[PDB]
Amino acid sequence: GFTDYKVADITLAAWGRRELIIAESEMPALMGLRRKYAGQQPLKGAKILGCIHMTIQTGVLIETLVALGAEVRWSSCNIFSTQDQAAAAIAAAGIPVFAWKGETEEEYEWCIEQTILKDGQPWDANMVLDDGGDLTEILHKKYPQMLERIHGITEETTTGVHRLLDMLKNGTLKVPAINVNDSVTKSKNDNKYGCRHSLNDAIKRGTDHLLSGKQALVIGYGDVGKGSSQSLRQEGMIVKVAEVDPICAMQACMDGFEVVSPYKNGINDGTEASIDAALLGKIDLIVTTTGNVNVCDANMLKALKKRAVVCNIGHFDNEIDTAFMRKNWAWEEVKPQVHKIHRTGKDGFDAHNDDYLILLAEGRLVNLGNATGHPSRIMDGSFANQVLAQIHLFEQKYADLPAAEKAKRLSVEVLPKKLDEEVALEMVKGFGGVVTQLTPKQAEYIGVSVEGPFKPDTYRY
Amino acid sequence: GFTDYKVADITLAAWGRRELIIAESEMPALMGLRRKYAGQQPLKGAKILGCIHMTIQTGVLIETLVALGAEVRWSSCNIFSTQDQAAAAIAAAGIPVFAWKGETEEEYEWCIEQTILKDGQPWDANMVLDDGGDLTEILHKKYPQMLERIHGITEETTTGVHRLLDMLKNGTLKVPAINVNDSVTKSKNDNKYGCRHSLNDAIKRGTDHLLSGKQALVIGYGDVGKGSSQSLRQEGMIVKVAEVDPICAMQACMDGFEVVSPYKNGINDGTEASIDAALLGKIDLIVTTTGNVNVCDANMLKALKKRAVVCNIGHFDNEIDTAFMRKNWAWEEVKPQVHKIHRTGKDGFDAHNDDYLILLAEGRLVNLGNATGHPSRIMDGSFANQVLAQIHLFEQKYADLPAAEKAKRLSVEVLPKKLDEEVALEMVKGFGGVVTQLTPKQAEYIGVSVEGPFKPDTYRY
Amino acid sequence: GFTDYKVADITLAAWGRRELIIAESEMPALMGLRRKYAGQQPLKGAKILGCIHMTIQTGVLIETLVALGAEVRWSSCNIFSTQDQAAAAIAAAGIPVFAWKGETEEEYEWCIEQTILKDGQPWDANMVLDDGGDLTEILHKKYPQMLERIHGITEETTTGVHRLLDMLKNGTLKVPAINVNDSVTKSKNDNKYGCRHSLNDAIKRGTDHLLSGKQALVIGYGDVGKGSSQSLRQEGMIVKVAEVDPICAMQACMDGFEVVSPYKNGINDGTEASIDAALLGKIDLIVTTTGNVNVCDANMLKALKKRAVVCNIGHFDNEIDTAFMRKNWAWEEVKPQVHKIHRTGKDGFDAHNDDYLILLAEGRLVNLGNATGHPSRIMDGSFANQVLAQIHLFEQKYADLPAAEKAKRLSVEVLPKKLDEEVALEMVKGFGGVVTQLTPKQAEYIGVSVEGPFKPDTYRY
Amino acid sequence: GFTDYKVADITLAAWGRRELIIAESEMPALMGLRRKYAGQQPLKGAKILGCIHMTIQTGVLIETLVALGAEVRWSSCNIFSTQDQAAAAIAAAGIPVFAWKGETEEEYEWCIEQTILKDGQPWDANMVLDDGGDLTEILHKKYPQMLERIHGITEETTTGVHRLLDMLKNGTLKVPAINVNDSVTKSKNDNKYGCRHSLNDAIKRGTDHLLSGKQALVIGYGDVGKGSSQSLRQEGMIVKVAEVDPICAMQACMDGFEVVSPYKNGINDGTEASIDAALLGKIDLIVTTTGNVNVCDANMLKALKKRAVVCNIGHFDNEIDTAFMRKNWAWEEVKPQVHKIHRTGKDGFDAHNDDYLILLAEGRLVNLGNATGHPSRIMDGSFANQVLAQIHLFEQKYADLPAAEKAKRLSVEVLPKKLDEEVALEMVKGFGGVVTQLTPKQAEYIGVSVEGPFKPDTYRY
Ligand SMILES: NC(=O)c1ccc[n+]([C@@H]2O[C@H](COP(=O)([O-])OP(=O)(O)OC[C@H]3O[C@@H](n4cnc5c(N)ncnc54)[C@H](O)[C@@H]3O)[C@@H](O)[C@H]2O)c1
Ligand SMILES: NC(=O)c1ccc[n+]([C@@H]2O[C@H](COP(=O)([O-])OP(=O)(O)OC[C@H]3O[C@@H](n4cnc5c(N)ncnc54)[C@H](O)[C@@H]3O)[C@@H](O)[C@H]2O)c1
Ligand SMILES: NC(=O)c1ccc[n+]([C@@H]2O[C@H](COP(=O)([O-])OP(=O)(O)OC[C@H]3O[C@@H](n4cnc5c(N)ncnc54)[C@H](O)[C@@H]3O)[C@@H](O)[C@H]2O)c1
Ligand SMILES: NC(=O)c1ccc[n+]([C@@H]2O[C@H](COP(=O)([O-])OP(=O)(O)OC[C@H]3O[C@@H](n4cnc5c(N)ncnc54)[C@H](O)[C@@H]3O)[C@@H](O)[C@H]2O)c1
Ligand SMILES: Nc1ncnc2[nH]cnc12
Ligand SMILES: Nc1ncnc2[nH]cnc12
Ligand SMILES: [K+]
Ligand SMILES: [K+]
Ligand SMILES: [K+]
Ligand SMILES: [K+]
């Protein structure tokens, strides 16, 4: 008689459950934590508000937290990223989840609100797991009294960490947080290799376009930009890379990419004259990866080669000026998450017009919107970190401390390197890899313990 | 009338000078510093003891320091790494240099001593530029009075930095140092991409072996191991990777390599029984990249496939147990830096014996020993950092500080990120790359200045 | 009032039509033929029985033949390869098509029969377009009177060509054929690069498995094996290749793959003892590419690592002994075209059993079964060849020739090189590529016409 | 007391002999033929004029022919391709060889003449082995009476085969020939993979330039162009490809290269206006691979980016207009086979001029001129074919036939596929590869013998 959920189609549960069982076999770090901590129940009494893409991989995360003793209430952090079979399997297990693929913005906020409210009143939540900071922001702005009982936030992604650090700098962050993004087994695994796997996957599913031999422009060359450029280059695209950070641009050059700017001499002065129209007129695919605002702007969209594909793999859709396209150009839906944007005008469209762009996922995160996001064996690292971070902040019991004790603990921290290494070891063993053990003499020679950690905290990998 | 040098053949100078003029055109960051600072003469009065591979690239470094006002006395930090035409060109310019390819160990020490002593007495040195820490160690052990007047050390390489940090922790470091290795435009340029360019280069020059289709084992997957594995994989080798650090091993797996140990279950217990003989018996090439001791040990050498190539690209030769091979097996020189090691015994050799290994550079740094090390356009980054570090420590004038002020400044530091970025920008422009400029709104959106720095100090790239 | 069709769901037609309009923009060679020949109507009077995967790409092929004057009746050549929106769009256009994704074998035969018969009697067919030879075989065995009036067969694929050549050698082939497979713009485009695009695509859609870091075994290294191995290697798989042809195996070695056999010393003597159990126990993915029989046999399936993925990209499913798996092991459907094969026995299954294989598309062509097959821009080459071949055989009018003249024309031929080159030129222009024109002196120097052909017929590319 | 030779330095013989002994271990097909045929002496009585690059690999070929009973007289087919240690080792073995690195054109012709003449009179030669057709041409034009006693020519390379086919077409070829180039274990091994190994090798040895991140233009995309493009792309160059053959251009696009022409719209009308100056002004490296004339012409050389590298890997230097550069621009030798070409004029040069090109090997085959050509394990295939071809033509005894028998045998033929496969098998075993044996049922299923051949003669691989 469980009704405390909202999903697209509960009859997808058995399919979702089959995929969860496969995903468990692909997630040895996460399932190792389930086995290790199940007897101890370290999350007994935890009540976790979770806001992260309701995929099969998030399902394994949810059920690990529950297996460790937690209660949860769950929503997705993006309108297109839910896998409806994953949501159904979680709801069928008696877990409150409010998520479906293809929400409206109003439905998106309503879903988050259904996690925060139980029976019309604030749930007695005491932990937060977030991806991008939307739940964290709603709590601080609209439900500040609830933060009086919450011990911590564990934040998944680069954009969400930025938002937390802004709150900390401004003195508005109310509970301590763990930056899960910056574990090496997250940032340099999920952010990079996850996008390598799933960017070309999403473009193929949405368009079935041949990529070999065509010209791509990747805006950004951080972790997501690195993985995205490789996703395209390994398919045979001719990839050009734009960057504002000269160190990242240096890496792009050494990795074998030509570094270009959409703007003449790199100067974005707001005029059409500043656009390198020759460059943009040759691009078949543009991908934004920055976490910044308006990096694929209206003048760039006007200058792109006819029939170019436009997509964003950063957290928020404002990387592309889709608002300009909504105001000026006609949208022809090809299928869900695939639209032809007719640059002829806004008053209907000609089904045979040759002057259109193909926009994927309406500019929302394309790997999750047009495919299934990162694969389970990659998300294993990110979500093992999430579980460890939830255990730590819940055990620390910040909400129970005296006000003086709270002041010294109000921070944004990362996990210790030793735990990062232990997650990595389980990942390596999952591939069948065999890590060598240092001899006592070798450990002494390089100045480390045989057990690790093996690198100083300054090490960049 | 200049005689204050010792090189292989001074008649090679004109050839060296032609290569220096080409290298200047490949080193825009370093030559940009030469142009920016020449008028100001920031190194006027500096007297630099330099100990680093006497290559064409080091020649451009030397002449940049001199162009900024320094005097120098120079030696190589490896017995096989000098390019004799580079050494000749520097000596022909009136610069004291003591370096040739193929020194003995006694000659190597004598060359360092010739930089320290001028006319039989300590030179009036006040700065140190070092690669690996050998000059730094000799000064601390044998010439402490000279360190009294030295303002700082700028150290090039991972191994040298480790030695500095040991001295700092023991309270034996006498002057402050800059860790040049850990600029991103050094570590994630030189250490990685430099070895990608130069490892396969050296193996080809030493052996002319086809690499495609053959089996390689790379010991280590830090920056050098990453570049080395790519150097071989891009040639079509089937590359396996060993590691003690599970995070580095995770990267190897995600990069498409099989992670293996020379020892059964990774346990190095000193017996032949622990060697994975089946694995080592299929390896055609082994490369050590660790900075550690005895990572290609006697039992591994005994188990390698007949005619395997053995080489080391870490700083010191003790990565491979070459002492064991000198004691037990006969060495047939093919040509300089290429030896067949006959596993039949040590009492002469059979020129037609099939049971040998090919050892490159007698186990010393193979890229420099059997080829020319990293290319100018990569060394541009490392050496622009060296020049900036020399300017900073020389301007700080630590030797002239009172004892109480010395105590506050005795440290090992890295260059600020802003300078790292400015070096990278010159490198990118050298490729013809165009970096984009943030708009004021974008810079505000991500919380940075339009001029940078663009990343927090914690960022790993 | 059109009812002469059978598809899954006619309401998918508008979606299919949108994808056809996109595919037209990705198929410049095929659309160029449509424009070049539309006025001349070279297929006026042609009545084409077509049997080839009812995809969007085949839709553009069908509508090109119709635009040139043909009437057609169409079926798919595989039970899982139809895209239902493509079938719907073709039926909605008034074209007889009998095809849906997920036919039974009985439905598959019924669909072919519906093209052959119209209103219960033989259609007035005079041309055949086939992929794999199934329609060709049915006509020869069951409808010889129909072949009397058929001018030729244009055969798409390696397996179908082999079947034609068998009939020719036995004197049972009744009408001439064009081997479309062996145009360079087919075999060395479609067979190789098509599988490079679509193999990893299908595995991702079926399983969402990370491929990087895992072990693959590709059986075969012809055109399909070459593209398949690249599809996996570019994702970071560690790919091993099996072959019976030592020249193809040599290419695999030089391409950077380890060449292995499932059998000890390559000897397939039918016993379990001949299986290299150590090798197969480390394989995460096996792909068959051979066009041969039982190349992934029962003993290999028994020896594979638990949870390995098993798939076939050759034309027919008998490359894998799926009959053995149907007889002995329980099948758990995950979703359409994805089955867990439980090696515990056949009397039901345990949903949590760890000892299963994942079989894709029930062993049928995996790229079409689990994804969408090759992309439009690659199929452009194959299908431009098909149109040219249909024009040529239809113009030759073999059925109308006297017996003595038929005897001189009964053959299996390829298209002339000049047409192969003209197809390629349109493909290159589609990428924006610019082919250089020889000067008269250069053309004389190498002995060719400025217009081509540029290579002798013996050239292998 | 052997004096019938001319080499650079006979004291290099011991070094050459050590490298020959290593090369034997890298050439299993060739050494397998030595072992197989040594007892039978199938070349007893053969007297072979040989004209092919006097490398270590050619040394193993020579000594295989001698071991099979032949006498030989040898020269190089290029002025820069000899390895002086290889020439010395052969001369020290008592084999007549006339070859050194850095011959003049006059010395080149004199060396060929020393093979043709013994003691001032024509040698009683009866077999010819040639690479490029220079010896074959001299025999036909200047020594036609010698061809009356010669049983055949075995020709190594694409350009030499073209010359033979021209003679055959004109009725001027006097003896039958075997096209060794067109074995698959030659053309699709040597021509492609050999250049992949040795192009980047030669550029690194000549210039030590970083290649990653720089722009290359490869003229041609046949076998040499394919291997050359990969040599550069795998180092991280951004490679553009020019072609006159649209099928080869199609392959370039699908392999992930942008296809461009040096001429606007591909039209080479002889004017400077036709040069795409924007394209050429961005190219850092141009490589000619065509076997054609003037594919890197004077107007292209004028338009290249300052400091671009120019080289040719086709057989003859006339691919580049070096004559134009000799007449107009000053040459500054950096070192042997490396020249800066100063575009400021011809009246001396400024050592610091920035407007120069770097020409490698004076436009002669760059892999052999600036490095050591293809590696032994690749040349194994080519030279096993050469030995088989020499055995066959010598056994056929064309010169001894009646005039009527000669007419029916005057042809240019390739080796049978069965032998091509047997060479390939030895190559595969050299990598440790294991070829699978077909079962009787499988061989029947695909219509081949279990022993091969496995493909029809039309197969392109
Ligand atoms: N879709 C996914 O699965 C996924 C995964 C991880 C992270 N993310 C999101 O992707 C975004 C990027 O994350 P990251 O970890 O790569 O961050 P990052 O900071 O490592 O990289 C962002 C890069 O963008 C560059 N950049 C900023 N403004 C630019 C501009 N105007 N033009 C060009 N380059 C510009 C920055 O210099 C930086 O190198 C964030 O929004 C993050 O939350 C998405
Ligand atoms: N030849 C060159 O041009 C060049 C360039 C840069 C640095 N170096 C030298 O190369 C060495 C490595 O430098 P780095 O910057 O890559 O250091 P690093 O710390 O980044 O990498 C060394 C790696 O070796 C691994 N390792 C240690 N012991 C091991 C063992 N027994 N088995 C397997 N892996 C083991 C460590 O876990 C680590 O990841 C140093 O000696 C450095 O000075 C050489
Ligand atoms: N799925 C697709 O889209 C697609 C595309 C083109 C062709 N095909 C089909 O794929 C198959 C292969 O086509 P192809 O053009 O690559 O043929 P091919 O003749 O070029 O290659 C087949 C290869 O299999 C090898 N082989 C045969 N028996 C073997 C065995 N027991 N073990 C290992 N290797 C073995 C052969 O030596 C040969 O090199 C055919 O059935 C063809 O019709 C499928
Ligand atoms: N250096 C080496 O080790 C080596 C090895 C093998 C062959 N070769 C030589 O290399 C040359 C090429 O041999 P191949 O086997 O690759 O021949 P190929 O016929 O396979 O390729 C030559 C290519 O050049 C193209 N081409 C011709 N004129 C052109 C032009 N003006 N612009 C652009 N492309 C043009 C042709 O279309 C063709 O595809 C020959 O001279 C051959 O003897 C050298
Ligand atoms: N599959 C996935 N599940 C959850 N969050 C993700 N972020 C990226 N891919 C994801
Ligand atoms: N190493 C080599 N020896 C002889 N001929 C060659 N052609 C190309 N490389 C060669
Ligand atoms: K997924
Ligand atoms: K160098
Ligand atoms: K498709
Ligand atoms: K060689």
Q: Which residues of C213-238 are buried (b: 16+ CB within 10 A; e: fewer)?
A: bbbbbbbbbbbbbbbbbbbbbbbbbb
Based on the number of CB atoms within 10 Å of its own CB, is D147 exposed (0-12), middle (13-18) or buried (19 or more)? middle
* Experimental technique behind these coordinates: X-ray
SS3 state of residue A316: coil
SS3 string, B153-186, reads EEECCHHHHHHHHHHHHHCCCCCCEEECCCCHHH
B185 touches B423 (CB < 8 A): yes
Take residue C444 and report the two structure tokens written for it.
Answer: 């004389």
Q: Write the single-letter amino acid at B30.
A: L
Alpha-carbon span D417 to D415, nearest angstrom: 6
H or E, element range at A245: none
> Within this chain, do residues C68 and C211 fall inside the same structural domain, yes or no?
no
Residues 6 or more apart in contact with residue A169 via CB below 8 angstroms: none
Based on the number of CB atoms within 10 Å of its own CB, is D427 exposed (0-12), middle (13-18) or buried (19 or more)? buried
- Compute the distance from residue D53 Cα to the ligand 6 centre, in Å: 6
Alpha-carbon span C115 to C117, nearest angstrom: 6
D114 CB less than 6 Å from ligand 6? no
Query: Among candidates B13, B55, B30, B20, which has minimal Cα distance to B374?
Result: B55
Residue A447 resides in a domain: no
SS3 string, chain C, reads CCCCCECCCHHHHHHHHHHHHHHHHCCHHHHHHHHHHCCCCCCCCCEEEEECCCCHHHHHHHHHHHHCCCEEEEECCCCCCCCHHHHHHHHHCCCCEECCCCCCHHHHHHHHHHHHEECCEECCCCEEEECCCHHHHHHHHHCHHHHCCCCCEEECCHHHHHHHHHHHHHCCCCCCEEECCCCHHHHHHHHHHHHHHHHHHHHHHHHCCCCCCCEEEEECCCHHHHHHHHHHHCCCCEEEEECCCHHHHHHHHHCCCEECCCEHHHCCCCCHHHECHHHHCCCCEEEECCCCCCCECHHHHHHCCCCCEEEECCCCHHHECHHHHHHHCEEEEEECCEEEEECCCCCCCCCCCCCEEEEEHHHCCHHHHHCCCCCHHHHHHHHHHHHHHHHHHHHHCHHHCCHHHHHHHCCEECCCHHHHHHHHHHHHHHCCCCCCCCCHHHHHHHCCCCCCCCCCCCCCC
Residue A224 resides in a domain: yes
Alpha-carbon span B162 to A258, nearest angstrom: 36
> Within this chain, do residues D182 and D306 fall inside the same structural domain, yes or no?
no
Enumerate the H helices of D255-334 as residue ranges.
Answer: 277-280, 298-303, 322-328
SS3 state of residue B309: strand
Alpha-carbon span C128 to C72, nearest angstrom: 9
Distances (CA, A) of D379 to A297, A399, C331, D15: 55, 74, 51, 20
Take residue D287 and report the two structure tokens written for it.
Answer: 């490589």
B335 to chain D: nearest residue by CA? Answer: D15
DSSP 8-state class, residue B435: P
Ligand 2 pocket test, pick from B198, B224, B248, B386 with the greatest ligand atom count within 8 Å of Cβ, gives B224
- Report the largest interatomic distance among the alpha carbons of chain B, rounded to a whole angstrom: 76
Residue C456 resides in a domain: no
DSSP 8-state class, residue B12: G
Query: Among candidates D254, D257, D313, D262, which has minimal Cα distance to D287?
Result: D313
CATH of residue D286: 3.40.50.720
Name the β-bridge partners of B356: B342
Q: Write the single-letter amino acid at C147.
A: L
Ligand 5 pocket test, pick from A189, A197, A382 with the greatest ligand atom count within 8 Å of Cβ, gives A382
The pair phi, psi for residue C452, each rounded to 5°, is: 85, 175
Residues 6 or more apart in contact with residue B391 via CB below 8 angstroms: B37, B42, B43, B68
> Within this chain, do residues B92 and B221 fall inside the same structural domain, yes or no?
no
Alpha-carbon span C90 to A32, nearest angstrom: 52
Q: Tokens 């050239």 — which residue?
A: C459
Alpha-carbon span B374 to B223, nearest angstrom: 14
**What is the number of the ligand closest to the CA of C373?**
9
SS3 state of residue B343: coil
**3-state DSSP helix/strand/coil % of chain A, to nearest 5:** 45, 15, 40
> Within this chain, do residues C302 and C337 fall inside the same structural domain, yes or no?
yes
Q: Which residues of A374-392 are buried (b: 16+ CB within 10 A; e: fewer)?
A: bbbbbbbbbbbbbbbbbbb
Alpha-carbon span C430 to C433, nearest angstrom: 7
Kindly give the number of the ligand 3 atom that is closest to the alpha carbon of C245: 37
Query: Among candidates A340, A345, A366, which has minimal Cα distance to A288?
Result: A366
Alpha-carbon span C415 to C419, nearest angstrom: 7
SS3 state of residue A415: coil
Alpha-carbon span B273 to A10, nearest angstrom: 57
Q: How many CB atoms within 10 Å of residue D350? A: 12
The CA dihedral of D184, D189, D192, D197, to the nearest 10 degrees, is: 180
DSSP state string for D63-102? HHHHHTT-EEEEE-SSTT---HHHHHHHHHTT--EE--TT
Residues 6 or more apart in contact with residue C120 via CB below 8 angstroms: none
Alpha-carbon span B2 to B248, nearest angstrom: 50
Distances (CA, A) of A452 to A429, A446, B28: 17, 11, 40
Distances (CA, A) of B28 to B40, B416, B422: 19, 20, 12
Task: Say how many Å lie between the first and final Cα of chain A, rounded.
Answer: 51
The CA dihedral of D361, D365, D366, D370, to the nearest 10 degrees, is: -60
Torsion sign, CA atoms B134, B137, B142, B143: positive
Of how many residues is chain C composed?
A: 461
Distances (CA, A) of C249 to C242, C459, D317, D380: 7, 21, 35, 16
Based on the number of CB atoms within 10 Å of its own CB, is C272 exposed (0-12), middle (13-18) or buried (19 or more)? exposed
DSSP 8-state class, residue D146: G
Domain end among C327, C356, C373: C373
* Cβ contact C243–D424 (<8 Å): no
A58 CB less than 6 Å from ligand 5? yes
Q: Where are the beta strands (DSSP E) in A22-171?
A: 47-51, 71-75, 97-98, 117-118, 121-122, 127-130, 153-155
> Within this chain, do residues B78 and B209 fall inside the same structural domain, yes or no?
no
Residue D172 resides in a domain: yes
Alpha-carbon span C289 to C365, nearest angstrom: 10
Q: Tokens 């330099």 — which residue?
A: B50
Q: Write the single-letter amino acid at A57.
A: Q
The pair phi, psi for residue A330, each rounded to 5°, is: -85, 135
Alpha-carbon span D134 to D370, nearest angstrom: 22
> Within this chain, do residues A87 and A55 fall inside the same structural domain, yes or no?
yes
H or E, element range at D10: none
* A102-108: Cβ within 8 A, 24+ apart: A102/A336, A103/A76, A103/A79, A104/A79, A105/A79, A107/A79, A108/A76, A108/A79
H or E, element range at B412: strand B412-413
Alpha-carbon span C78 to C54, nearest angstrom: 9
Answer yes or no: is D270 a known binding residue. Answer: no
Strands B117-118 and B121-122: antiparallel
Residues 6 or more apart in contact with residue C456 via CB below 8 angstroms: none
Alpha-carbon span A273 to A261, nearest angstrom: 14
C297 CB less than 6 Å from ligand 3? no
D115 touches D96 (CB < 8 A): yes
Query: Among candidates B98, B25, B102, which has minimal Cα distance to B377?
Result: B25
Q: Tokens 């006297």 — which residue?
A: C402
Alpha-carbon span C197 to C231, nearest angstrom: 6
Residue D311 resides in a domain: yes
D37 touches D384 (CB < 8 A): no
Q: How many CB atoms within 10 Å of residue D69? A: 16
> Within this chain, do residues C383 and C362 fall inside the same structural domain, yes or no?
no
Q: Tokens 């089937």 — which residue?
A: B238
Q: How many CB atoms within 10 Å of residue A428? A: 26
Q: Which residues of B314-342 are buried (b: 16+ CB within 10 A; e: fewer)?
A: bbbbbbbbbeebeeebbbbebeebbbbbb
Distances (CA, A) of B191 to A140, B133, B301, C197: 45, 17, 26, 34
SS3 state of residue B397: coil
The pair phi, psi for residue D294, each rounded to 5°, is: 55, 50
Query: Among candidates D93, D315, D103, D125, which has minimal Cα distance to D220?
Result: D315
> Within this chain, do residues C186 and C140 fall inside the same structural domain, yes or no?
yes
Catalytic sites of C, residue numbers:
53, 76, 81, 131, 156, 181, 186, 190-191, 195, 315, 374, 382, 386
The CA dihedral of B227, B228, B232, B235, to the nearest 10 degrees, is: 40
Q: Tokens 């998520």 — which residue?
A: A99
Residue B448 resides in a domain: no
Take residue A6 and report the two structure tokens written for it.
Answer: 């909202």
Q: Which domain holds residue D178?
A: 2-192+374-433
Query: Among candidates D220, D289, D288, D212, which has minimal Cα distance to D252?
Result: D220
D361 touches D337 (CB < 8 A): yes
Helix orientation angle between B417-430 and B376-396, rounded to the nearest 10 degrees: 150
Kindly give the number of the ligand 4 atom that is closest to the alpha carbon of D366: 1
Residue C442 resides in a domain: no
Take residue B90 and report the two structure tokens written for it.
Answer: 């520097």
Task: Report how many Cβ contacts below 8 Å link chain A to chain B.
Answer: 200
Query: Among candidates A322, A434, A421, A429, which has minimal Cα distance to A369?
Result: A322
H or E, element range at B247: helix B246-254
The phi-psi region of residue B327 (left if phi > 0; otherwise alpha if psi is between -120 and 50; otherwise beta) is alpha
The pair phi, psi for residue B95, each rounded to 5°, is: -105, 130
CATH of residue C95: 3.40.50.1480
DSSP state string for D36-73? HHTTT-TTTT-EEEEES--SHHHHHHHHHHHHTT-EEE
Query: Among candidates A57, A27, A20, which has minimal Cα distance to A198?
Result: A57
The CA dihedral of B10, B16, B20, B22, to the nearest 10 degrees, is: 160
Strands D330-335 and D309-312: unpaired
Query: Among candidates C92, C61, C58, which has minimal Cα distance to C76?
Result: C58
> Within this chain, do residues C75 and C154 fall inside the same structural domain, yes or no?
yes
D153 touches D128 (CB < 8 A): yes
Domain end among A357, A373, A389: A373
Alpha-carbon span C135 to A127, nearest angstrom: 64
D245 is catalytic: no
Q: Tokens 């515990």 — which residue?
A: C344
Domain end among C373, C390, C406: C373
> Within this chain, do residues B52 and B172 fall inside the same structural domain, yes or no?
yes
Residue B4 CB-half CA count within 13 A: 17
H or E, element range at A239: strand A238-242
Strands B177-179 and D309-312: unpaired
H or E, element range at A453: none
Query: Among candidates C398, C415, C412, which has minimal Cα distance to C163?
Result: C412
Take residue A251 and report the two structure tokens written for it.
Answer: 């890496």
> Within this chain, do residues A314 and A410 fall inside the same structural domain, yes or no?
no
C306 touches C238 (CB < 8 A): no
Q: How many CB atoms within 10 Å of residue C169? A: 10
The pair phi, psi for residue A8, each rounded to 5°, is: -65, -45
H or E, element range at B97: strand B97-98
Q: Resolution in angstroms for this experimental structure?
A: 1.4
Alpha-carbon span A304 to A283, nearest angstrom: 6
SS3 state of residue B460: coil
SS3 state of residue B194: helix
Annotated binding site of C for NAD(+): 157-159, 191, 220-225, 243, 292, 313-315, 367
Structural domain count, chain D? 2
Enumerate the H helices of A223-280 as residue ranges.
Answer: 223-233, 246-254, 277-280
> Within this chain, do residues A262 and A364 fall inside the same structural domain, yes or no?
yes
Q: Tokens 């590419």 — which residue?
A: C289
Residue of D237, D239, D240, D258 best to disrupt the A interface, most CBs of A under 10 A? D258
Q: Tokens 């900075």 — which residue?
A: B291
- Report the largest interatomic distance among the alpha carbons of chain D, rounded to a whole angstrom: 76
B45 touches B69 (CB < 8 A): yes
Query: Among candidates B324, B329, B265, which has minimal Cα distance to B297?
Result: B324
Alpha-carbon span C326 to C346, nearest angstrom: 8
B157 CB less than 6 Å from ligand 2? yes
Alpha-carbon span B431 to D284, nearest angstrom: 10
DSSP 8-state class, residue D187: I
Residue B447 resides in a domain: no
Distances (CA, A) of A144 to A112, A226, A244, B344, C114: 15, 38, 37, 79, 69
Task: Say how many Å lie between the first and final Cα of chain B, rounded.
Answer: 51
The pair phi, psi for residue A453, each rounded to 5°, is: -70, 155
Take residue C13 and report the two structure tokens written for it.
Answer: 């037609």
